[PDB]
Amino acid sequence: GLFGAIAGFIEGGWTGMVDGWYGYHHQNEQGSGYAADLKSTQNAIDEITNKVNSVIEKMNTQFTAVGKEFNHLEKRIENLNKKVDDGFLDIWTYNAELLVLLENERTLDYHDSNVKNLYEKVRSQLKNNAKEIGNGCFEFYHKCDNTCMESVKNGTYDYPKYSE
Amino acid sequence: LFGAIAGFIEGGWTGMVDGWYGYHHQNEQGSGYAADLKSTQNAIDEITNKVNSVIEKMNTQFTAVGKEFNHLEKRIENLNKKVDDGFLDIWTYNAELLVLLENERTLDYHDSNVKNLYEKVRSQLKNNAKEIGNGCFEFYHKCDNTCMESVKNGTYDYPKY
Amino acid sequence: GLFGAIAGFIEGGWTGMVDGWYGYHHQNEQGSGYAADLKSTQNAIDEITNKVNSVIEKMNTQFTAVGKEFNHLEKRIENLNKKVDDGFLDIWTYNAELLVLLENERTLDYHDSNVKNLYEKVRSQLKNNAKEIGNGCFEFYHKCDNTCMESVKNGTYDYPKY
Amino acid sequence: DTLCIGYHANNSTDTVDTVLEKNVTVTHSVNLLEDKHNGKLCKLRGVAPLHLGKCNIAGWILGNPECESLSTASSWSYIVETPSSDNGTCYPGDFIDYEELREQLSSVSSFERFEIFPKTSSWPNHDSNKGVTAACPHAGAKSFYKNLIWLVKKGNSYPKLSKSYINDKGKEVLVLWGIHHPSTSADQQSLYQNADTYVFVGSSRYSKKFKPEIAIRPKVREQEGRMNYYWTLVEPGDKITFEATGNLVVPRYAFAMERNAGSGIIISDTPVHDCNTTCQTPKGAINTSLPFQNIHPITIGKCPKYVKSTKLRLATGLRNIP
Amino acid sequence: DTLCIGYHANNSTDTVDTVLEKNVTVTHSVNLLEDKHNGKLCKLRGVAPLHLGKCNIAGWILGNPECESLSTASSWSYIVETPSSDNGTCYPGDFIDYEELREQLSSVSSFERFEIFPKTSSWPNHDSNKGVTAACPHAGAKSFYKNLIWLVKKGNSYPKLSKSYINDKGKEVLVLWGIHHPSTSADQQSLYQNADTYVFVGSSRYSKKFKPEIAIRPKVREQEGRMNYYWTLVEPGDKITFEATGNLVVPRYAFAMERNAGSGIIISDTPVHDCNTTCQTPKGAINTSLPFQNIHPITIGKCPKYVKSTKLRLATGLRNI
Amino acid sequence: RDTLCIGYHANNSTDTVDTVLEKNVTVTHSVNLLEDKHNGKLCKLRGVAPLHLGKCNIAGWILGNPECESLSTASSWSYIVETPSSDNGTCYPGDFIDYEELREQLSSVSSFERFEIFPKTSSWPNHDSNKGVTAACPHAGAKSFYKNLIWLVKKGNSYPKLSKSYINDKGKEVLVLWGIHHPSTSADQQSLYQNADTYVFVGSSRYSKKFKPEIAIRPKVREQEGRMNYYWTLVEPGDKITFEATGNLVVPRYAFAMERNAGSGIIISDTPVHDCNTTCQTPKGAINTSLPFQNIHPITIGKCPKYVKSTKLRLATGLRNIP
Ligand SMILES: *[C@@H]1O[C@H](CO)[C@@H](O[C@@H]2O[C@H](CO)[C@@H](O)[C@H](O)[C@H]2NC(C)=O)[C@H](O)[C@H]1NC(C)=O
Ligand SMILES: *[C@@H]1O[C@H](CO)[C@@H](O[C@@H]2O[C@H](CO)[C@@H](O)[C@H](O)[C@H]2NC(C)=O)[C@H](O)[C@H]1NC(C)=O
């Protein structure tokens, strides 16, 4: 979207990965499988939760009884009251509507950023030892077993292993 | 914000008049500009929607602002004046800030689209061309017109050299 | 945060660099040292200043005297007045609170962007002549003296190198 | 041997709008808009509302023979009238500062009704029994407000009366009384012998002299005469004085009262129940943490801001793909 | 053989402001701020406004001899007075609940004026012809309001009068009347023989007795006496009763009336025209979809929010190079 | 081996700020958008200082209560200051009509000169203008009364119909005040104004009202079972006002040539008044600020920041802080 990752150079998402928002899909001699990025996913959940909570928690209201009664000879102040009520209605409706539109735009870009960053993290980790397919996929030049895939997720990937 | 527009691509092309983002090819068959059809239309759609959202969301009531009060109702007259000036300050501030905010984002939105269009082609021709650094690619393999096509269509599907 | 630079692949900041927001730390045979990116830092200062000024300057208020007096037999209009006062209080409090939260989020991302961009600028300048350590650090393959480090900051870097 | 990097997806159909794009399908989302009420009138802070049901405030405080339900509750968070509750001032007249009174009574901390001027001992020189009318019927029989007494002459004699009450409670006392305007000067002397009369009420802050306006008003509930109703709050330690040579509908019951501002009155058919709520609307109570509600503009309590929006769906997940 | 990637540019000079930068030149932009009006007073809903021109509401409803040309209208969306329209209550006095009345009359659905108490048949025992004054001149001649009649004694006799009207229309009836306060007790008996008089008006909801306050007020339009004007709305099926031993300026014309809330009154010199509008200001109508306007704070209809801003330019294109 | 790093600033700063995504984020630099600082003083508003009544309230000040004798030396003021404990106003129990409206009209005045509309010596030749004092308005043990009004009583068993008129020859509006006295007993009535059935009439081009004394015993207030209602009206330049009474009229002595400028109010506070400038005033003190928001006080006078419930509005200008 804004970061070119989600619905970008990574065209689609994985219905298979159900344990997190962002993750990996390994493919070696020991089989295949999906696996969410524990730390990366939890961080978004925390921040997104905080976001939703901020939008809600910041609305601290007074104890008020809207609604007034006026007799047939107080139509003016009745309409004054009606004006202040409709005045607040237009103000809150507009802000609320726009707040949602704005925050939604940002949130989607927030996820795009997290995916793009997770890719950059791995790519700048295995420079030569693997080539970019271009689909958010890395093809290993050196055989990579399961305990090897681990050193990539944990971000603890040794290098000294360049082959051909 | 994305380093593209007025970034590593210093200026814009007055020559390209058919779109917001595009290419300028240079081979043996000549030169020319050409907007990225799909890329440009997308921005137009989204930017249009943006402008429409800012406008369409403002749904107002049928009201007659303005009240009349006699010389012995100065208090409620000033109350009315207060609610009017209260709305004036609220709307002015929000409208002013809404514009400032949305303008900042829009300019960054375009910066993003250009940066993305560059990334798209760069990650398409890896070795077959080298980055000049000015948002320009210099081909190592001769590239004719029907070749430039396979780059725009994003169907540069055969890395021959 | 959003661009992966600050508190990202560049884990920490330099208390040593005190003359700017973004900068470099060179390391060659002529010694070491920090140095802020003049142009890059000034730009952020201008824009961030404008930001703060926009949030403030756009608030243009009327000359008004809030506060009304009502007698014991005007409790209704007194409460009406109270309603309009508390109505504005809730509106302004919420907007102000949210405006800060939003703008702070953006500002921090704004700096993340500037650092990421400064890195990209240098990296795409010395392609082979240096390798990425991965910590926002470049290790030169060709010896780089002080007047050489200059051609990197000025963005005026050549490439004869091995 | 390949390793791919991707994102979540699911069967979700939730859509949300952005500034740039409408109807965007997302994996997860929350609704900021509360659009759900329990269709009940519930209790406010911790106290229940005062339900008049058949009657309106006017009828309730004056003691209309129809509003004779209960020894009413000593406190309430707000008041509930029904859109069809008609029984108030049965004898045609003008209730002065009625709206103001309703506001003052909207929410009460303590509220005990007492006999300010005991019927038996208070009026020895006037008839306190003949004061009934066909405009205020209670089971076929002619009757009148319970909290007031229509003092008429005692056999061709209406001596200047003068009664005073001194607020010995610890709180404000709400005192109500009426002034009667006969239709004809004959009805005048028939009721209070004297032709030219006057009524005077006065306390430390209140003071007003009343002159009966005698004339034929168009028939209302059989009455060509009128009766205006007045009220005032007597501060603790203060005293109020009544004085009349006729036409005075004297107080019988008053109200020791302590009020807490910040409430109002709901006109609704919605049933009252035994439940808690922090926010009340004429359509029902609202239990929510959300910032906005589109249920009703007129609200009582600590409530969400009323909005015209139909849906405020906030995206939390990301774009949804297969 | 090279391929470059770039962005649009043009001769545009449009500038916009951002949170970070001011005066930023942009390829394309739209204005969210409506600052353009047609300098005309137009029809609001589908209906045109009631223009009093020379007169104000007071003069118009009482029937000031000068407001004789006006209300060819059975409905109006709002009312227009001119800042210099002075002709209202020619006989000095106090118009009770005047502002409230103006509000109630601001917009009406149906509005027909009828003769509630026909001059010829209604008052047989009182003089309904001598009731004219030099304070209400119509072409040099002494005259008076058209909708009221100043009943004076009929040759040294002013019998207690009692007239009742019963609202047989299907709508509310607006009834107006006046109470006259002579300057001297001599003027009092000169006009209504009786010295101690009273007037009484009463319906199902209204009821008030009036006592003439006789005294010398400072001359206004030649009058040391005063005349207060009253009004009330009689519900359908209800009846209103007038009763006086003098000093009563009786109703002649009333108004069958059906009102629709939500409108107001514009005091402006701006010409009224035959055009449609969804939003009206004293300076002129506003045709727009924009959310904000800086034309005028006082508005009538479904309008854009009034803002103090001078320009709200929203960027749609990108930076211009 | 040769190399070059790219990084960002950091410092000893402890400033924290909140974002939409994260709370308590330490930053290198920041500014506060929330003004929470006042000078605890009541200062001048535009140029002008406020009118301080101190001991008295508006009622007492304009009527000329014997206690508010020290004050009316200002010809203009930006706003008015009463103290929460200033109790001296209408010493004689009564009803001040449209009092709140008056207070509003008087809240801020451009020019304000007090003159003797009806000179005591020359105005009332057929009535006693000296006996009109009461124990309800004491000035140093002695019975006294409002300075701006005169309680006209009969002159030895005679109270002739009086009729006095003033014509506004100033260039501005004139504020005229007067009272109507309602005796407690019909005996007190003839004792003061011989006539039993009396009336008072006031009239100008716009004002007109006849007053009938309501005689009765009200509960004792400051020793008075009788009452006295106070009325006021603004007479337009060139207009004239007429007083006429057969008794019970407390006639005007001093009026006020006055030019008013709307847009101000009245502060009830103990906060000391000083000689300082301010663009924004609160009951707690003045506010000197450019910030958009303040949480000092909701009730404000002048060109002020919007009142907010927030405790801190810290806006981040620098970046995240690391060691
Ligand atoms: C109480 O309220 C009712 C309803 O408004 C009054 O009106 C009539 O009461 C009679 C007697 O039972 C009924 O026959 C009518 O149906 C009622 N009218 C209508 C339209 O419902 C009733 O008179 C009132 N009684 C008192 C004592 O106030
Ligand atoms: C002004 O205020 C003072 C104070 O309230 C009034 O004095 C009170 O009068 C009574 C009657 O004897 C004393 O017992 C109280 O002690 C007084 N209060 C105080 C604080 O001394 C005084 O009457 C007022 N004077 C006027 C004309 O307003």
Ligand SMILES: *[C@@H]1O[C@H](CO)[C@@H](O)[C@H](O)[C@H]1NC(C)=O
């Ligand atoms: C999707 O978006 C369009 C444009 O707002 C709207 O007309 C429609 O209601 C939406 N479609 C559905 C199926 O809800």
Ligand SMILES: *[C@@H]1O[C@H](CO)[C@@H](O)[C@H](O)[C@H]1NC(C)=O
């Ligand atoms: C830049 O801003 C200034 C100050 O607001 C304004 O007067 C000027 O017109 C702007 N420059 C241009 C060319 O729009």
Ligand SMILES: *[C@@H]1O[C@H](CO)[C@@H](O)[C@H](O)[C@H]1NC(C)=O
């Ligand atoms: C941080 O620490 C020292 C010790 O207080 C202080 O002197 C210095 O001013 C601080 N640094 C900066 C740049 O404020």
